[PDB]
Write a protein that binds this DNA or RNA. Structure first.
Lengths: 549, 83, 140, 62, 37
RNA sequence: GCCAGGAGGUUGGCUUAGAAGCAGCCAUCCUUUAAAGAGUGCGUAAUAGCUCACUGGUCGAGUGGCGCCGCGCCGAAAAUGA
């Protein structure tokens, strides 16, 4: 129930903009099915049963006929946006020769113009042979597929011909496992003949390759072939290096390369922390055969926190990845939430006394540093001034007293992380010929900085990303809702074409795995891009709640 | 909504056909399957059976789908609002 | 085919885009709003800008027609009484001052718009709308 | 495991090709890296030690 | 709301209807569905 | 109760990514009118719309609001059987 025509049709030019000319019409809506009519060749192939053991093709049962007839007319009428014969023929009211249909229609079909809607039902084997015939009639041969793009062994354009005498030049795709013929590469050549038992050579990372046996997955059993032709398709054994998307020419064959540069860009970011880091490198071997059988994902550690991160382009994707892990790799890794790099700063001018009045066994290393410290905008940078009130602190502390300002600014006072985006300054000090080393005033700077940042108005500058919601208006309003509900704030709404994209502030702590969320609120109308901006405060209470140990 | 002989065999969201039977004092009558008609000769026991079928398969279920007198459906967010 | 759909909007002078809901109203039109953009900007060459009302239409065989109108009185007061963005809040701060002639042109310009297509009401009318935007007045 | 010098990436895998040779640096410097391997492939633009420092054959195509 | 000793007419579209003995506060939205209990 | 007008400066100004009677601060109009407010509530991403307000058509007799006092009602659950 729900099996229809106008449904699908409407949906086509209402969800993309196609041109759904169809060529077959049903005999009985839901349960009441018995076969199809064909406004193409003007015939009514009808299947008198589900299994399809005894089918037929009698004319219209009485009520249809005229119905499909107008659509037949439509067919020829639409064919007026192509040649010259058909158009003028409908003008004449002349009958289309049964094969100019095959013409003008396969014309538009392969020309990406018309939408040869053939249809049917699977379980009740109906509406089948009509579309197999429709394959053998309207589905494009490699003769009609235009010059395939690519690069040279030098650097320009390419012309990959269907030529079964042309230079061996191929592509390959899938990396199959196998017991007997092991590593199996599923390939579609392009231009160039290849022998069973000869050689080849990878035209990517360069590797002379032995071709063992060309093969064709013939439905049930697999069929071993003598050769692969220029344009034909098949899978080969050997190629003990060939990965995926590799361009493969022969041993010679002007070492040409294929264009095809696709992208499995990151959209998911889930963390993973195995129990003890012994299981970890072990699972780096797990990944060693995970990242080497399935490209896609990116296994990138974070810098400002340990724990390798699993990034990728799919929710359930990453998840059944994790399943395969807890299946044939058995790892104990309490799948963690992604951590955050937290910088920090202040908002006040504090004057302090970095006085190191300490005369050890004579050498001291005493350093009285009088600094003024000033704070400025989050995004500015690090400042300091060559500020001597008159001529106090030696010119050998100048690039090394401020070190202890920098040095003691990798470890913040709170939970302790790099305190950034601040000015600083200085102003005075005290100096003594022997009783003072470079590092003495470096550490005077350490003391100075610690007191002047502990007592200086603490804060935490957690990072915040910009994000481009790529989606239409409906779910746009919806997601603007969500994003407000994600602690941050938006700030961008430029009306695009088939979409309307929203530039959005969202707080990196929040916005965790937002695709999973997004991929729902819009059902599926695209997504966004990770466009990181800058950092700002966590609204008071989130700062102290995080004060742990 | 079908009507065979005396009984009405409507088929709603339920996994089985709904089988009602016009009792003493009133008559139903199903013109087309998309809308049942009820000639009720008893204003009291009438709306009781209207409500019988309405409450047999209640409509509006968040988005839509069900049995409406004609009372304009109040919506609520469909594939959403369940975190 | 699409028969008669007159849809009018509020496109200011400078935006050369069919941005929604200009699409789902003038798409069922086949709108030469691009022609509205390059024949109305020059029509008001005296400033070539300001927010101006419009009216576009379709006649079966895809036939367009734009109909333009006049600038608004809060912009047509900002240019006059020397306001920048405004006199921040109508109950506190004031910039310029409206006398017995600036008001005259405020009504003159916008004669065929306000409400009453009559002069002897319009002046005082927007002179009150003046206080709604936050501009003081010299009274004589 | 060390490295053959300037021009790095290496992150966390690389298949750093355990090689051999200590110095007065890092209490170890034993079993060096190679650049080329599964990763690194030498200095972005190197004109000499291309026998480990990656870069193929500086064809400036001119 | 929904069942509490302090029943209000909240959004004016609600009524107090002393049905079946005790007080309810009915409207359109069943979210306002108080009760004197 | 029912039919219907339910307006124009306008998107008040201030804000603000936008705040359009309608998230928030000040405000604290004036006009076409019989009557329509710088707005009561829903709704929107903000507009849109729905909407009250207000006023006539119908109508034909009583209504809308606030306080007080008497008795109640909810408030009001525990252990063997009342």
């Amino acid at each position: 129930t729900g099996a229809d025509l106008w449904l699908v049709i409407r949906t086509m030019q209402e969800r993309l903009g196609a041109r759904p000319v169809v060529m077959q019409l049903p005999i009985g809506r839901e349960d009441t099915f018995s076969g199809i009519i064909d406004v193409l060749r003007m015939k009514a192939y009808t299947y008198g049963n589900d299994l399809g053991t005894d089918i037929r093709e009698i004319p219209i049962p009485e009520e249809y006929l005229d119905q499909a007839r107008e659509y037949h007319e439509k067919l020829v009428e639409v064919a007026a946006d192509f040649d010259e014969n058909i158009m003028l023929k409908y003008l004449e009211g002349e009958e289309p020769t049964e094969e100019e249909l095959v013409a003008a229609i396969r014309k538009g079909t392969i020309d990406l113009k018309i939408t040869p809607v053939f249809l049917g039902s699977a379980l009740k084997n109906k509406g089948v042979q009509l579309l197999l015939d429709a394959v053998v009639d309207y589905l494009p041969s490699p003769l009609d597929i235009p010059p395939i793009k690519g690069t040279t062994p030098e650097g320009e354009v390419v012309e990959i011909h269907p030529d079964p005498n042309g230079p061996l030049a191929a592509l390959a795709f899938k990396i199959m496992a196998d017991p007997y013929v092991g590593r199996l590469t599923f390939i579609r050549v392009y231009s160039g003949t290849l022998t069973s038992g000869s050689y080849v050579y990878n035209t990517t990372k360069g590797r002379k390759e032995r071709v063992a046996r060309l093969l064709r997955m013939h439905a049930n059993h697999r069929e071993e072939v003598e050769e692969l032709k220029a344009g034909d398709l098949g899978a080969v054994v050997g190629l003990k290096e060939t990965i995926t998307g590799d361009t493969l020419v022969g041993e010679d064959a002007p070492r040409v390369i294929l264009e095809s540069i696709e992208v499995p860009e990151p959209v998911i970011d889930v963390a993973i922390e195995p129990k003890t880091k012994a299981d970890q490198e072990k699972l780096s071997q797990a990944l060693a055969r995970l990242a080497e059988e399935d490209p896609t994902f990116r296994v990138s550690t974070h810098p400002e926190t340990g724990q390798t991160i699993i990034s990728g382009m799919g929710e359930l994707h990453l998840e059944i990845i994790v399943d395969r892990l807890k299946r044939e790799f058995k790892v104990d890794a309490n799948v963690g939430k992604p951590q955050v790099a937290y910088r920090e700063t202040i908002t006040k001018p504090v004057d302090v006394e970095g006085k190191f009045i300490r005369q050890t066994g004579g050498r001291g290393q005493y350093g009285h540093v009088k600094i003024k410290v000033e704070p400025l905008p989050r995004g500015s940078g690090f400042e300091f001034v060559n500020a001597i009130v008159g001529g106090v602190i030696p010119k050998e502390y100048i690039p090394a007293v401020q070190k202890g300002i920098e040095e003691a600014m990798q470890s913040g006072p709170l939970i302790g992380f790099p305190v950034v985006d601040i000015k600083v300054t200085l102003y005075d000090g005290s100096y003594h010929e022997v009783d003072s080393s470079e590092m003495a005033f470096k550490i005077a700077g350490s003391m100075a900085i610690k007191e002047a940042v502990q007592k200086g108005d603490p804060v935490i500058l957690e990072p915040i990303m910009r994000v481009e919601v790529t989606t239409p208006e409906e779910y746009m309003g919806d997601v603007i809702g969500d994003l407000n509900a994600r602690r941050g704030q938006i700030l961008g709404m430029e009306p695009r074409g088939n979409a309307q994209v929203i530039r959005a502030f969202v707080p990196l702590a929040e916005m965790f795995g937002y695709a999973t969320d997004l991929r729902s609120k819009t059902q599926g109308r695209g997504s966004f891009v990770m466009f990181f901006d800058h950092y700002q405060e966590v609204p008071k209470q989130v700062q102290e709640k995080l004060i742990k140990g | 909504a079908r009507l065979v002989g005396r009984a009405l065999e409507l088929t709603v969201g339920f996994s089985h056909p709904v089988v009602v039977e016009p009792p003493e004092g009133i008559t139903f009558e199903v013109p087309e399957p998309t809308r049942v008609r009820v000639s009720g000769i008893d204003k009291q026991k009438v709306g009781q059976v209207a409500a019988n079928i309405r409450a047999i398969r209640k409509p509006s279920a968040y988005h839509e789908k069900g049995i409406y007198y004609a009372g304009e459906p109040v919506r609520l967010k469909p594939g959403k609002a369940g975190a | 085919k699409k028969v008669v759909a007159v849809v009018k909007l509020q496109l200011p002078a400078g935006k050369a885009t069919p941005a929604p809901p200009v699409g789902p109203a003038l798409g069922q039109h086949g709108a030469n709003i691009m022609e509205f953009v390059k024949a109305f900007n020059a029509a008001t060459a005296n400033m070539g800008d300001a927010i101006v009302p419009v009216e576009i239409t379709i006649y079966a065989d895809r036939s367009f027609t734009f109909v333009t109108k006049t600038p608004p009185a809060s912009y047509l007061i900002r240019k006059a009484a020397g306001l920048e963005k405004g006199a921040h809040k109508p109950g506190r701060e004031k910039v310029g001052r409206i006398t017995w002639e600036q008001v005259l042109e405020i009504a003159k310009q916008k004669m065929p718009d306000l409400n009453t297509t009559d002069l002897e009401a319009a002046a005082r009318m927007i002179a009150g709308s003046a206080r709604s935007m936050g501009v003081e007045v010299v009274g004589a | 495991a060390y490295i053959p010098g300037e021009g790095h990436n290496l992150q966390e895998h690389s298949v750093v090709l355990i090689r051999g040779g200590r110095v007065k640096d890092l209490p170890g410097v034993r079993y060096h890296i190679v650049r080329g391997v599964y990763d690194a492939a030498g200095v972005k633009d190197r004109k000499k030690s291309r026998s480990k420092y990656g870069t193929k054959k500086p064809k400036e195509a001119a | 709301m929904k069942v509490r000793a302090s029943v209000k007419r909240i959004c004016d579209k609600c009524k107090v209807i002393r049905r079946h003995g005790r007080v309810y506060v009915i409207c359109e939205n069943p979210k306002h569905k108080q009760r004197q209990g």
